[PDB]
Ligand binder design. Structure first.
Ligand code: LE8
Lengths: 402, 549
């Protein structure tokens, strides 16, 4: 009922980010939505004296048909002072985890009157034939990094009853998301989730996203098992082994290259010497153990790389230092839209990253900027948005992960 | 007296930590001062300014300019006060494009140079607007004035004027959805599809509604066509203002840079306009000789410009179509239309500056640009007609290492067709000779060698001058391609060359890449394999020795 004082970083102005083109249907959804939010006092029109701006658009969450307003607060969040939730290392270990959109709770808390001007956004018009409808926020806005940090006191209270009643459940909050982990059976699971919606309606949001840990975290590197090796097979193996030697100490290829002794046809079969096989086996051994000195450090950036492998398969690795992977994965679930798949891959990787480390990674996307910037908002369904850059040079490494 | 509602003020502030202006009132002639005093007395009479006492420490210089007329004009120079005023939210940042307008049966334009003065200025901010008419012979105190209304030339007049008109007009537009309203400078545009009787009625209702705020508009005393932002707007069609390509038997850098502006502007409706060579003549205000390639490209601009072309307005009930053609030299041209041959607009796309490229990638980028342009103008993606076969597109995107996509589209068979010029093998080729290639160069002497060693005992090493490791690694591949049959396996340790060929260029800045491309086009099958250097991989080792000597 009384606002929390918030201010940007020292010497940083509010965001001045141009609105990007919206389709007619997204414009219409936003007009209807913003009209009601104004009627409900969550937002208010503003005049030309406010110079700041943040982009806005419209998504559809997964398995619903109603448009949702998404403000891309990425710039405001960078400029929003740091606010002083810890990360529960047990969340990633629960048999299951459901994800709940609680961003609607925020609209009940006023916003520091002096900060409001910074939540400025424009609904554009087609062909700019009418002035953009401009608004700012009066309440905590979805997607702002402050909104969880501020509501954090009110949310602890709303939960204490349920937490004290189920001391085995883990509960974590990132952006407008509540992550509720369990170790029960889905049916018992679903109900307790239904339970947890009642506190919020009682204190007052029906959607639930499923999610279980993987198995390996860092998928092992594996070598072929063959009864006959062509020269090509051995050339690919030595290449893969040499790559892996930047990650793992004692990888040796002397005895395998030895086999490639001369100028043979790529398809000719080489029987492996006894040395050769031994060397291949010691490398196999090595690859089973973990990497050495591989630690997460919450002060540094997480980095996610994605490779398109074809046939709806996508590989990815999350690291901080090169060759020190904290997680590696594969994804194969849009059978004709490369960009929808990539966009779903980015969302899935970002979700895993929130559950493991409580923050989002910086993506290196195997796509041209202009394609990605002209199509990702059509397939986006999360209420957060990570950072990204663009790989323009084909990695030679895509092979080592297939 | 009919009561008039006030125009609520817009809070203005100066930039943080900055303060008003304090600049010297220039000395004037007695003839000029006399003229200022009369004008400023009439503005004060009307309400636009007010006399201030001497506490005000701010000053903006003021001038008198002779109307090219025996009458003088006053000119307050706020360049200084502007630097110190806050930023505003501009809305005119995006201007509409005529292709996005709808056809109107009737269209009027009111003029609003009277209301702009019914727009008060934020009280707390007037003080910053002080100016001084110097006195005759400097023997009295200068007269001191400040503004009570948005001043011509102030940083915040456009925004605040627009925003105030908008809010006035809003209820009237909402209660008349059968018309459109749009405001720019002192000009209000009202169009509709009503019969002229009903249309002139509503223009009357509009003037009445503007009277509620005491805003007086011209009497029935224009109509189509309008000149606006360099367009000619008619009720059922639009085109640019005329495009006259000057004749010149001697062209200079200022003349060539202005010939690409005109061609660029005209390229939004005049189909197939090109600007490559002329734009190139500007690479990196000197008379430059037009190449023979620029005089045949200019002679093609003058014949496309010979007569006028018109564009149609947008009919939301019909699909949008966009059609692209390959012009050559990384140039693309497109048209957007709903009914055959009646374009709403046209345009062109140019290759991004890179070292290597291919047609499919360029087509894709042009599609993306047309796509974003269409979201801006019509709120939707057009359907595409593209000179590329469905099978070609499918081969491209399923094998390309990046993610790529183009929206709903159909093949249109209008040459030249975009195609894939070669495809590398996924597996080594049985029965094809295996070429182990290698190349090396001495960083100091720029001397190196390139060559290959094959499984049939074929061999070659060529000595080279003025080369680099990178150039010898490509030359080696080039040699193996030159000396092999229609099917061939090639082993290289060059990550450099791999990165280039796996990009699948069809054209290059490097003539060495282009020769390789030309060889690849002639092969039936090529499998390109990579091995790490210096690991003693057979053949790679052999040929490394031969080329590193
Ligand atoms: N002759 C003529 C003529 C023919 C058709 C139209 N149609 C139209 N649809 C939307 C608008 C508003 C508008 C202008 F009226 C003017 C500039 C920008 C703008 F957004 O106008 C307008 C005119 Cl002026």
């Amino acid at each position: 009922i009384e606002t929390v004082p918030v201010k940007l970083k020292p010497g940083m102005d509010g965001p001045k980010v141009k609105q990007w083109p919206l389709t007619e249907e997204k414009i219409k959804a936003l007009v209807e939505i913003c009209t009601e939010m104004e009627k409900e006092g969550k937002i208010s029109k503003i005049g030309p004296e406010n110079p700041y701006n943040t982009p806005v658009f419209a998504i559809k969450k997964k398995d619903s048909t109603k448009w949702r307003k998404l403000v891309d607060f990425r710039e405001l969040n960078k400029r929003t002072q740091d606010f002083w939730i810890p990360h529960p290392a047990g969340l990633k270990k629960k048999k299951s985890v459901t994800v709940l959109d609680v961003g609607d709770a925020y609209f009940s808390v006023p916003l520091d009157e002096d900060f409001r001007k910074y939540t400025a956004f424009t609904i554009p018009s087609i062909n700019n034939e009418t002035p953009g409808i401009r608004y700012q926020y009066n309440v905590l806005p979805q997607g702002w990094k402050g909104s969880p940090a501020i509501f954090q006191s009110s949310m602890t209270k709303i939960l204490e009853p349920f937490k004290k009643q189920n001391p085995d459940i883990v509960i974590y909050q990132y952006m407008d998301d509540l992550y509720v982990g369990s170790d029960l059976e889905i049916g018992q699971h679903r109900t307790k989730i239904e339970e947890l919606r009642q506190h919020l309606l009682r204190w007052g949001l029906w959607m639930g996203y499923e999610l279980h840990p993987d198995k390996w975290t860092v998928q092992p590197i594996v070598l072929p098992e063959k009864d006959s090796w062509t020269v090509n097979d051995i050339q690919k193996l030595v290449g893969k082994l040499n790559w892996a030697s930047q990650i793992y100490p004692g990888i040796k290829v002397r005895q395998l290259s030895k086999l490639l002794r001369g100028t043979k046809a790529l398809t000719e079969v080489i029987p492996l010497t006894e040395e050769a096989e031994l060397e291949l086996a010691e490398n196999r051994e090595i690859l089973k153990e973990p990497v050495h000195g591989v630690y997460y450090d919450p002060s540094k950036d997480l980095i996610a790389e994605i490779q398109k492998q074809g046939q709806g398969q996508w590989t990815y690795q999350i690291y901080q230092e090169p060759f020190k992977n904290l997680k590696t994965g594969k994804y194969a679930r849009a059978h004709t839209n490369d960009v929808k798949q990539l966009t779903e891959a980015v969302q899935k990787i970002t979700t895993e990253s929130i559950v493991i480390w409580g923050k989002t990674p910086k993506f290196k996307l195997p796509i041209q900027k202009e394609t990605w910037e002209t199509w990702w908002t059509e397939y986006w369904q999360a209420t957060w948005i990570p950072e990204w850059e663009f790989v323009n040079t084909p990695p030679l490494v895509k092979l080592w992960y297939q | 007296m009919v009561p008039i509602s006030p125009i609520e003020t817009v809070p203005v502030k100066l930039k943080p930590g900055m303060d008003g202006p304090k600049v010297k009132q220039w000395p004037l002639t007695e003839e000029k001062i006399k003229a200022l005093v009369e004008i400023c007395t009439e503005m004060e009479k009307e309400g636009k300014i007010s006399k201030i006492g001497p506490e005000n420490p701010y000053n903006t210089p003021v001038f008198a300019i002779k109307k090219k007329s025996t009458k003088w004009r006053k000119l307050v120079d706020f360049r200084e006060l502007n630097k110190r005023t806050q930023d505003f939210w501009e809305v005119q940042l995006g201007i509409p494009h005529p292709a996005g307008l709808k056809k109107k049966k009737s269209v009027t334009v009111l003029d609003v140079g009277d209301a702009y003065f019914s727009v008060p200025l934020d009280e707390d901010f007037r003080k910053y607007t002080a100016f001084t008419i110097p006195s005759i012979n400097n023997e009295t105190p200068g007269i001191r004035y400040q503004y009570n209304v948005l001043p011509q030339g102030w940083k915040g007049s456009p925004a605040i004027f627009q925003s105030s008109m908008t809010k006035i007009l809003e209820p009237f537009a909402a209660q008349n959805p059968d018309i459109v309203i749009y405001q720019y400078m002192d000009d209000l545009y009202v169009g509709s599809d009503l019969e002229i009787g009903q249309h002139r009625t509503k223009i009357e209702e509009l003037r009445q509604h503007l009277l509620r705020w005491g805003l007086t508009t011209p009497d029935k005393k224009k109509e189509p066509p309008f000149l606006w932002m360099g367009y000619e707007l008619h009720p059922d069609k639009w085109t640019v203002q005329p495009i006259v390509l000057p004749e010149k038997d001697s062209w200079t850098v200022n003349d060539i840079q202005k010939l690409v502006g005109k061609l660029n502007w005209a390229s939004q409706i005049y189909p197939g306009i090109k600007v490559r060579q002329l734009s190139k003549l500007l690479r990196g205000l000197e008379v430059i000789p037009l190449t023979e390639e620029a005089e045949l490209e200019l002679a093609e601009n003058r014949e496309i410009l010979k007569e006028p072309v018109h564009g149609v307005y947008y009919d939301p009930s019909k699909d949008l179509i966009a059609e692209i053609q390959k012009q050559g030299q990384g140039q693309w041209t497109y048209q957007i239309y709903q009914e055959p041959f009646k374009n709403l607009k046209t345009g062109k796309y140019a290759r991004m500056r890179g070292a290597h490229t291919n047609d499919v990638k360029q087509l894709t980028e042009a599609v993306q640009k047309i796509t974003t342009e269409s979201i801006v103008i019509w709120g939707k993606t057009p359907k595409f007609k593209l000179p590329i076969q469905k099978e070609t597109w499918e081969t491209w995107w399923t094998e390309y290492w990046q993610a790529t996509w183009i929206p709903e589209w159909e093949f249109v068979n209008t040459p030249p067709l975009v195609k894939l010029w070669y495809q590398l093998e996924k597996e080594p080729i049985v029965g094809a000779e295996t070429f182990y290639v290698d190349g090396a160069a001495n960083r100091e002497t720029k001397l190196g060698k390139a060559g290959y060693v094959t499984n049939k005992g074929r061999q070659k090493v060529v000595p080279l001058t003025n080369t680099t490791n990178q150039k010898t690694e490509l030359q080696a591949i080039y040699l193996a391609l030159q000396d092999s049959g229609l099917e061939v396996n090639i082993v290289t340790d060059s990550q450099y060359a791999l990165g280039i060929i796996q990009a699948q260029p069809d054209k290059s800045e490097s003539e060495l890449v282009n020769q390789i491309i030309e060889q690849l086009i002639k092969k039936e099958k090529v499998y390109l394999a990579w091995v790490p250097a210096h690991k003693g991989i057979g053949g790679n080792e052999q040929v490394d020795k031969l080329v590193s000597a």
